[PDB]
Write a protein that holds these residues in place. Structure first.
Motif, PDB file in Angstrom:
ATOM      1  N   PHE A  30       0.849  -1.176   0.000  1.00 52.52           N
ATOM      2  CA  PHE A  30       0.000   0.000   0.000  1.00 52.52           C
ATOM      3  C   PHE A  30       0.890   1.232   0.000  1.00 52.52           C
ATOM      4  CE2 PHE A  30      -3.676  -2.553   0.924  1.00 52.52           C
ATOM      5  CZ  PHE A  30      -3.126  -3.643   1.615  1.00 52.52           C
ATOM      6  N   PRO A  31       0.318   2.386  -0.352  1.00 52.10           N
ATOM      7  CA  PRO A  31       1.049   3.651  -0.402  1.00 52.10           C
ATOM      8  C   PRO A  31       1.527   4.132   0.961  1.00 52.10           C
ATOM      9  CG  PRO A  31      -0.871   3.727  -1.787  1.00 52.10           C
ATOM     10  CD  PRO A  31      -1.047   2.562  -0.871  1.00 52.10           C
ATOM     11  N   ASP A  32       0.725   3.879   1.990  1.00 50.79           N
ATOM     12  CA  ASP A  32       1.049   4.333   3.337  1.00 50.79           C
ATOM     13  C   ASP A  32       0.598   3.363   4.419  1.00 50.79           C
ATOM     14  OD1 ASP A  32      -1.825   4.826   3.403  1.00 50.79           O
ATOM     15  OD2 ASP A  32      -1.354   6.636   2.246  1.00 50.79           O
ATOM     16  N   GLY A  33       1.080   3.593   5.639  1.00 49.40           N
ATOM     17  CA  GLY A  33       0.706   2.742   6.751  1.00 49.40           C
ATOM     18  C   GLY A  33      -0.777   2.884   7.027  1.00 49.40           C
ATOM     19  N   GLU A  34      -1.293   4.078   6.762  1.00 49.28           N
ATOM     20  CA  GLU A  34      -2.702   4.390   6.967  1.00 49.28           C
ATOM     21  C   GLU A  34      -3.608   3.358   6.291  1.00 49.28           C
ATOM     22  OE1 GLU A  34      -4.193   6.862   3.942  1.00 49.28           O
ATOM     23  OE2 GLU A  34      -5.868   5.534   4.428  1.00 49.28           O
ATOM     24  N   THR A  35      -3.233   2.965   5.079  1.00 49.84           N
ATOM     25  CA  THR A  35      -4.007   2.011   4.297  1.00 49.84           C
ATOM     26  C   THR A  35      -3.653   0.565   4.640  1.00 49.84           C
ATOM     27  OG1 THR A  35      -3.724   3.656   2.525  1.00 49.84           O
ATOM     28  CG2 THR A  35      -4.880   1.626   1.975  1.00 49.84           C
ATOM     29  N   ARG A  36      -2.369   0.315   4.864  1.00 52.88           N
ATOM     30  CA  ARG A  36      -1.918  -1.024   5.216  1.00 52.88           C
ATOM     31  C   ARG A  36      -2.642  -1.415   6.498  1.00 52.88           C
ATOM     32  NH1 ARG A  36       2.724  -2.031   7.402  1.00 52.88           N
ATOM     33  NH2 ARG A  36       2.101  -0.422   8.910  1.00 52.88           N
ATOM     34  N   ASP A  37      -2.827  -0.426   7.369  1.00 53.93           N
ATOM     35  CA  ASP A  37      -3.495  -0.639   8.638  1.00 53.93           C
ATOM     36  C   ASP A  37      -4.959  -0.952   8.440  1.00 53.93           C
ATOM     37  OD1 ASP A  37      -1.167  -0.331  10.056  1.00 53.93           O
ATOM     38  OD2 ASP A  37      -1.781   1.527  11.086  1.00 53.93           O
ATOM     39  N   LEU A  38      -5.655  -0.126   7.670  1.00 56.18           N
ATOM     40  CA  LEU A  38      -7.077  -0.385   7.435  1.00 56.18           C
ATOM     41  C   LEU A  38      -7.246  -1.803   6.917  1.00 56.18           C
ATOM     42  CD1 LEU A  38      -9.987   0.214   7.250  1.00 56.18           C
ATOM     43  CD2 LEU A  38      -9.603   1.490   5.133  1.00 56.18           C
ATOM     44  N   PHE A  39      -6.372  -2.199   5.991  1.00 57.90           N
ATOM     45  CA  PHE A  39      -6.386  -3.536   5.396  1.00 57.90           C
ATOM     46  C   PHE A  39      -6.440  -4.582   6.508  1.00 57.90           C
ATOM     47  CE2 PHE A  39      -3.832  -7.287   3.913  1.00 57.90           C
ATOM     48  CZ  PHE A  39      -4.669  -7.714   2.892  1.00 57.90           C
ATOM     49  N   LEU A  40      -5.436  -4.547   7.382  1.00 54.14           N
ATOM     50  CA  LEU A  40      -5.342  -5.457   8.513  1.00 54.14           C
ATOM     51  C   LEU A  40      -6.651  -5.454   9.294  1.00 54.14           C
ATOM     52  CD1 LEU A  40      -2.692  -6.705   8.291  1.00 54.14           C
ATOM     53  CD2 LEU A  40      -1.815  -4.480   9.023  1.00 54.14           C
ATOM     54  N   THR A  41      -7.235  -4.267   9.401  1.00 56.37           N
ATOM     55  CA  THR A  41      -8.490  -4.063  10.107  1.00 56.37           C
ATOM     56  C   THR A  41      -9.610  -4.789   9.400  1.00 56.37           C
ATOM     57  OG1 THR A  41      -7.849  -1.860  10.929  1.00 56.37           O
ATOM     58  CG2 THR A  41     -10.195  -2.359  10.879  1.00 56.37           C
ATOM     59  N   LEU A  42      -9.690  -4.636   8.082  1.00 57.97           N
ATOM     60  CA  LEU A  42     -10.741  -5.323   7.352  1.00 57.97           C
ATOM     61  C   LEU A  42     -10.696  -6.808   7.711  1.00 57.97           C
ATOM     62  CD1 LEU A  42     -12.271  -3.319   5.599  1.00 57.97           C
ATOM     63  CD2 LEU A  42      -9.848  -2.845   5.264  1.00 57.97           C
ATOM     64  N   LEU A  43      -9.488  -7.349   7.835  1.00 59.32           N
ATOM     65  CA  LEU A  43      -9.296  -8.764   8.142  1.00 59.32           C
ATOM     66  C   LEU A  43      -9.715  -9.141   9.552  1.00 59.32           C
ATOM     67  CD1 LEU A  43      -5.768  -9.258   6.578  1.00 59.32           C
ATOM     68  CD2 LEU A  43      -7.942 -10.022   5.600  1.00 59.32           C
TER      69      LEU A  43
END
Lengths: 183, 182, 182, 183, 183, 183, 182, 182
Positions: free
Chosen positions: G62-75
């Motif tokens: 992902f472009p930033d941790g902000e999105t990588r984090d949301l991703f993990l959250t979706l999971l």
């Protein structure tokens, strides 16, 4: 392990029945066809197939052993599990289902919810000559099952059957083994 | 867990039997030799070995405890599972299979589909001795509880010397109190 | 799942017995002591503890629930499996073993093969406060058992025991539950 | 697999009983309420739900299949296991529990130990439109859907059969609808 | 497998950092204290402990191997996992933690969230005589014991070597003792 | 996957070493013998064997590939895991260990802590003719490895080697395959 | 374990990119949007989420941790795996997706293939109170993070922030820890 | 995860290579054909397929992405694992293996050790078509996100009609915004 359950039919549902044996009520999944023949408060024997997985233990019952065996065979195809197997049979009686699988009727199989064009093709390919396409043959199957080579298994069976015709399928097998066990 | 099944033979096939007990028909796998002595519509009992696996629970039956135990002993060998254990037995009756092993007959074993020269030698190696009166059984039971043979013997001799004609079990528990000593 | 097996005794070995219940003979692993009280061809019952594992399904019998329970308890301890547990019980009866534990008699515990130095201390520490020391106490533990705290599982119980003069521990439990639910 | 046990009650406890069927004493877990109706030395039957895990095989008993089914349903919610399910049913009788769930009574569920504000909400979201309370057409469609058919196609065939066969049985209707569906 | 990571610090957080070694940015968990000494945009090294589970592969970093080893040791206690271990080390610095443990300071451990009266006691029982603080002979025996030799036999050979080779190295002593042991 | 690690030796312990590659420090287990040759602050390359299990990922290093291979072979015997394998080697250098395994020296093996009288016998039996008891042979091993039958694999190798002698081991294999692939 | 990959872009496909970091080319699954900003033969970095499973080890950039984090959250949501998660993000950027979730816009969520009726409600219910809305707040969550309650994680923090005029969120955390420890 | 390895060939064996990258030497399994083009003490790069399993993590390398993908496609067939996938490729180069399958040549495949008449037919059946310009790739990427072909096409045509010369990626994200529509 559990090949059959005989007892008082305590409940006839739309996708299963509950038969009580020595006070224990076993739930056995079945097709409408198989269920229609069952009545509550009556005794009944079904030929089952116990399928154990890590988080489950289920019974699937049928009228006869030929049908129950057919179920186990459907299971041997890749991607075809207990449920899909039952559905195939709920939609197509054993006799028809077999027929379809010989006539390579891919149109028919498709109708069974869950069987795509390819899925059907894999089923037809995997078992057209394993459903229906007798002393001799049975004995060699037995020997091949024990790990013997076919064109040698049948070599013993002919010797035995020829040397002794009156032989039953079982005695014939014992004999073949004695010759294969190389005395 | 299931050590035996006694009931009506509902079906005698070429590689297994179905015995009904309490309206429950159990599929018991067996050799043609064992399968012979059975008749449909008759009452029968087979000594079994229940093998539990993630996606399976299968029963293997035999005529006597002795044979059922040799079956499990084969399983104890690396590479040998139930199917092959059964085949070995179908090709060689318990008595003979025992000799082939004890006698270290690589040729005979090799006649079993699945057992190669290497595999035969392993079985001969690991089982050679593994194939086969109160003193021995009592110390054995003791060693079975982790006790050291030497110490196991040294308590059994003492007990059998206490009173002589003592049930093997009686000598065993008696030896245990002595071992929970002080 | 199987709490007890009652049937004809078909065989009595040194580390187990086979009870045939309704045609099915179950192998039940027991201690020499327990096995002592059993004679073949006779009807017998045994309180059992069924241990289910991936590749095994084994039974363990005892004279009473009191012992079957302690057994299960021994297994609560990290590092202690069924063999060692049975061994322990074979070396010390449920009563005594409890004493060894409550009295932290590590010297006696180590007498059991497989349990050494720290192994014993580990056990003594893990089991003392749960080995061997009324309608109110139970009913509360039963609520604490369903997850309820105690401060609340005691008030609801006191409320009901003072309400209904004093009756069944059962109705007291399902009565405390009804209050705890509104 | 085991759907019910019937035999002599060997021991009634505060959270379980022991029913002895044919020599085998099965331990079945239940709620104080379910346990109430039972008496030691008496012959009793209980509808069970057998949960098999990797290192466990347990029975959970109830008064009737309806309740047993509720239990199984509770288990279909992520985070909700056998223990929590029982606790839920120990605090709220089945009727009460279905009521609460249909009425999003999060306050009531939260009362159950182990169930928090969120959990109660997931449960209510999960179970609500899925409760046998909160009749031949629907069931048959239900079974047809269960076998893998889509709702649309299922109704279409069920209606046909019923219109032709005035009004009959879920059974026959099911068997007849499957025939049409088989093309 | 990964015992340490060294590279540019890409991000210092409150419970973890990101060290970038050769293009790969590894996330390593640590305590506020360990994190303190670190500065973003700086090159830094951390002694790690790689815990691989079925659905996880994580790094836990520390200032030196001594501390890292303490962490691994905490994990050897039944019921004590990576998270609890970290928490333990976040509340009590390594020295303090070893101290407490050797002094059965159950009161101090209980202070750590997640660790109760019992837990503290098991830990103290488990760890106490097993703490690198609370020298060539012992180590060599330690290694000989580690390789599967019994303490008695191990000392016997280690003493021999040392007596012969006045005093030398744990290394050579070890290699020489193994030679004798090889018979 | 990781066949070797080359880098700066950051730490030489009694049962392992830590080599840093591109900032990543890998812990690699080894015998005293292998370690003795290593010095801190120096560069070093070890031929490793990465062994992955469900809850671990470990590296075992050795001087050469012949030794590393020997380790992997010891692992193929039943009941012989990573640790025991290392111990066998810590106690007996490759050259000796091999020797012992040919001379069926069961006395020697026993000395290795963990190897009983029987264990040693299984090891000797399993690999006496798989340690040391050349164009031709290598090529057939390659073909047998791809699943070809020996007495046919060697039939192709002779044709190839005879038809073209100057052949290297690799080209010889390519050739055999072309003939076996049946053009 | 792998938080980010930075190297030469060797290939840019439609559902993933290959970044060669120190000779090793890692496949990183990304969204068309993210993949848009990348050109072959160029140096590039990507914040990743490494998903480890029994038979797989996959990266997600992902472009930033902000999105990588949301991703993990979706999971974090039951029923949502990496494919569906990425799909979701491919249909809605991290920013927007957060809106859809906070605003419980189930009609938009269902626009993502694989997420239907209740699937969306399930997500909306599980993520709202954790999607998208200071030295004191963090330091406390960090203590709550190590297991500390809040009533106590707030007092220790207030104690230290009033003690040390006001400095690093770091030292405040390790300072609150020192108090919380004695 | 590891899509490729580029470094010094430390060793070229008969069934695999060792390439050192950042002082880490990776064992890359490969066919003799691929193995030929390699020389020790030289810099090389192989496109790989990393197969993760409970007790293993193995790399399989090839000359190009194309070939590495056909490798994975073979794995997708029931009964075919990495060893056999590799053997099939060793006996038949990618180009030929592709034809044998596409052409449904049961005889050729059978020449591969392990692939019988039945197994050959399965591979022919399941892969026959599975072996093989902006419109198709874009809808494919879309269908890869679960979208229905019909709907996938109907948004791609619209986009390519927006502006015509558009990167395949640009058409893709553009079609996505249209699908996250309303």
């Amino acid at each position: 392990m559990i090949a059959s359950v005989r007892g008082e039919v305590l409940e006839v549902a739309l996708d299963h029945v509950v038969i009580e044996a020595a006070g224990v009520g076993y739930r056995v999944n079945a097709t409408p066809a198989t269920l229609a023949t069952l009545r509550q408060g009556t005794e009944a024997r079904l030929i089952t197939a116990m399928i154990v997985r890590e988080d489950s233990m289920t019974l699937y019952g049928f009228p006869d052993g030929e049908t129950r065996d057919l179920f186990l065979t459907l299971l041997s195809v890749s991607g075809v599990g207990p449920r899909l197997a039952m559905a195939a049979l709920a939609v197509h009686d054993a006799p028809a289902l077999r027929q379809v699988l010989a006539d390579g009727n891919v149109a028919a199989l498709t109708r069974v919810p869950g069987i795509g064009k390819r899925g059907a093709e894999r089923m037809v390919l995997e078992l057209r000559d394993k459903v229906g396409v007798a002393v001799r043959s049975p004995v060699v199957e037995a020997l091949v099952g024990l790990g013997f080579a076919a064109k040698q298994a049948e070599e013993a069976t002919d010797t035995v059957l020829a040397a002794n015709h009156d032989a039953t399928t079982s005695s014939a097998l014992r004999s073949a083994l004695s010759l294969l066990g190389k005395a």
